[PDB]
Amino acid sequence: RMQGAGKALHELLLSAQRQGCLTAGVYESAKVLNVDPDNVTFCVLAADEEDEGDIALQIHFTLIQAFCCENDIDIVRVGDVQRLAAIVGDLHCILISNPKDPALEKLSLFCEESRSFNDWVPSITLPE
Amino acid sequence: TARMQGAGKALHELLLSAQRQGCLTAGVYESAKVLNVDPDNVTFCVLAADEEDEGDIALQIHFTLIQAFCCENDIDIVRVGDVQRLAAIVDLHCILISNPNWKDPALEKLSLFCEESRSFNDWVPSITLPE
């Protein structure tokens, strides 16, 4: 795949935040997807190694992920939940909605490229 | 093994009363959020699904999470199978009743219904809404 996906995610998170385009949290995210999926352009699921044994969380993730995939919403995983919080400052789910965004374009391509080698929900490493 | 009678009538009154008081929450997504943010405020939950809804796996999994959470937090919870009748009274697949921070008579009766159900090891009993 392309390099710099983590950079583009960093950029997009900050841009979306300043534009009032972010929704955070599993419960609110699931609600927004149910109500108006058409305006959602990106989803980040974030889980650290420990989060893997939190069954209710992972099930929430599974439902959110299946919905994103069924509705052609770009979605990625982030394992550095600390670094994600440090950027936007749980935070287990973040949706980005539409308010020209090169960072979103690059991420869209990254997801497209991932799909080309059958990696439907790719991991992104956040930059320091 | 016959139940306390009048649970359906009590639920009918509780739904109307809660709506009138502005302390009813409706919908799976909104209910999950409300439950999660302050379970202490929630006094009753109704999970509603017709026979065809039993094959709606996403819905049933949401129900499983809401139910587990209610049980874990000692929130009285019941199942209702007639979504059309529930709709005539009040996404109505989940309803919460919260405290308008009331001791409504119907809530007390339903709390006793859930207590009797637990003494029969029926953790999440069914209520039939009357016509």
Description:
- 2 copies of one chain form a homodimer.
- Helices cover 50% and strands 15% of the residues of chain A.
- Chain A is an alpha+beta fold and 128 residues long.
- Chain A is built from 5 helices and 4 strands, in the order H-E-H-E-H-E-H-E-H.
- Chain A has a single domain (1-128), classed as Ribosomal protein L30/S12 (60s Ribosomal Protein L30, Chain: A, 2-Layer Sandwich).
- Chain A has helices at 5-19, 26-35, 55-70, 81-88, 102-116; strands at residues 22-24, 40-46, 75-78, 93-97.
- The two termini of chain A are 20 Å apart.
- The first copy, chain A, has a 4-stranded mixed beta sheet.
- Chains A and B meet through helix 2 and helix 3 of A and helix 2 and helix 3 of B.
Provide a count of the helices of chain A.
5
Structural class of chain A: alpha+beta
At CATH level 2, the architecture of chain A is: 2-Layer Sandwich
Could you estimate the helical fraction of the residues of chain A in percent?
40-55%
Oligomerization state of this entry? Answer: homodimer
Domain count of chain A: the total is 1
| Record field, number of beta strands of chain A | 4
Instruction: Please provide the ordered H/E string of secondary-structure elements of chain A.
Output: HEHEHEHEH
**How do the strands line up in the largest sheet of chain A?**
1-4-2-3
Beta fraction of chain A: 5-15%
| CATH homology group of chain A | Ribosomal protein L30/S12
Biggest sheet overview of chain A = 4 strands, mixed
Biggest interface:
A-B, 12 and 14 residues
* CATH hierarchy class name of chain A: Alpha Beta
* End-to-end gap of chain A: 20 Å
CATH topology of chain A: 60s Ribosomal Protein L30, Chain: A
Shape of chain A: globular
> Radius of gyration of chain A in whole Å, from Cα?
13 Å
